[PDB]
Design a protein around this nucleic acid. Sequence first.
RNA 1: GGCCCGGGGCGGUUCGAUUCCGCCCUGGGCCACU
Length: 437
Amino acid sequence: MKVEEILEKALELVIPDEEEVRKGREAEEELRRRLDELGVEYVFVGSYARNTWLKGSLEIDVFLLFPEEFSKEELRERGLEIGKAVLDSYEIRYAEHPYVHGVVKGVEVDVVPCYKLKEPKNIKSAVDRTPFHHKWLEGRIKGKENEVRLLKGFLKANGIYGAEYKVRGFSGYLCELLIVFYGSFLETVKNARRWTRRTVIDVAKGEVRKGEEFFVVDPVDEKRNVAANLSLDNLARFVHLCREFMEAPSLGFFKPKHPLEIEPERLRKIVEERGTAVFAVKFRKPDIVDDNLYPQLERASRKIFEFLERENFMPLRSAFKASEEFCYLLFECQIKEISRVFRRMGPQFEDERNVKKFLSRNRAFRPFIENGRWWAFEMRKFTTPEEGVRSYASTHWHTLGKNVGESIREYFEIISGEKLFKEPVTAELCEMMGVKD
RNA sequence: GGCCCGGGGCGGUUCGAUUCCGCCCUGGGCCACU
Ligand SMILES: Nc1ncnc2c1ncn2[C@@H]1O[C@H](COP(=O)(O)OP(=O)(O)OP(=O)(O)O)[C@@H](O)[C@H]1O
Ligand SMILES: [Mg+2]
């Protein structure tokens, strides 16, 4: 097991077989014919146009070029009209920039409308750079497409591929830029081992400098950070994965990790061993796009975690899961039950004005003096994390994300114990607690 | 939708709040959906 031989075997996993390629070329030819029959102006971009698409994950991107004077509404209406007329079956679901997704002779297709600008200067639609990325890449990625595939396969197998909010990882484009910059997958991995959270990679200048945060400047637009949505943690996982890989090569790094089935009876025993409070807030999943949902699940989950820490329940970690039916914010605290009494800091004995106001307070236990200042015993309105969250969630629902919050407002429940291990969250909990196997 | 920076109004908590928990108005960037 040496890098050399391993990467040789890995190609079998990332390179599309001749049949899959034929399927794409055949689908390409059909798109062309449907589009030419409409006399539409288009251009093939992305993975398929450059032959850097990962085996099994083929998607053809067709970009409909529109004059700059056109309305964003005209693009949407016209582009959606063209997309629907050109796909066997289609689906329209997006967060902001419109596009049609569908199928042609068996392969996934994305028909997207954009403005045909000159200079990726001041983009008008969110996707106007894409055509220029193609221009900039077609002449430089030639001969190294399999190197790109190795990188994509590597990141995909380890859950950090996509740049969408569900993953906060490396986009396909970023991968190609990295390949152009380092020359190959091995080189990229070798150098990535020394990346820092301040690393700046400028491919157009062929330079690596120190910066404010992780920044990969787009050759097409120097102000654009291609890795803007790559989370710090995901950057850290990659760098580490790169160290581990070079240290002990294995094509296991290209094989998707074990689905993991682990029985609920085992989870119960682990939680018992841990002596922690493991619970979850359950509510109905809002009918909105992944790209809108996840950031809200992140916020809600975080706002509640902070409530748990300032409330002294010693939160350990939080996680979340979304099924098609419901959503779950998961928590584990070191404190299952806290006392009713606690001490609140008061003024220094020195100024009677404030000491006076501090003592006029109707109180159950009579404040005391300790180290030069007054302190008072106070009673909590709740003593467990669950009682706390039920309280917080019912009252601060509006701060847990627009849609996620509104849903919790109309309904939510706190699941714990055995009734929790039944829900579709065992995987997430095991992951959250670091259960190995 | 989420994040970041900023205006102007407020409610609650607190001995004490610009500073802690939040709500309305609003201006400007950015990110995801290709
Ligand atoms: N998040 C993004 N950041 C930058 N460019 C992007 C992003 N998403 C899409 N693009 C542009 O649109 C093109 C199409 O992206 P798409 O989502 O189809 O993935 P891809 O790049 O085709 O690779 P793959 O299909 O193998 O994931 C990219 O090649 C790039 O030019
Ligand atoms: Mg594609």
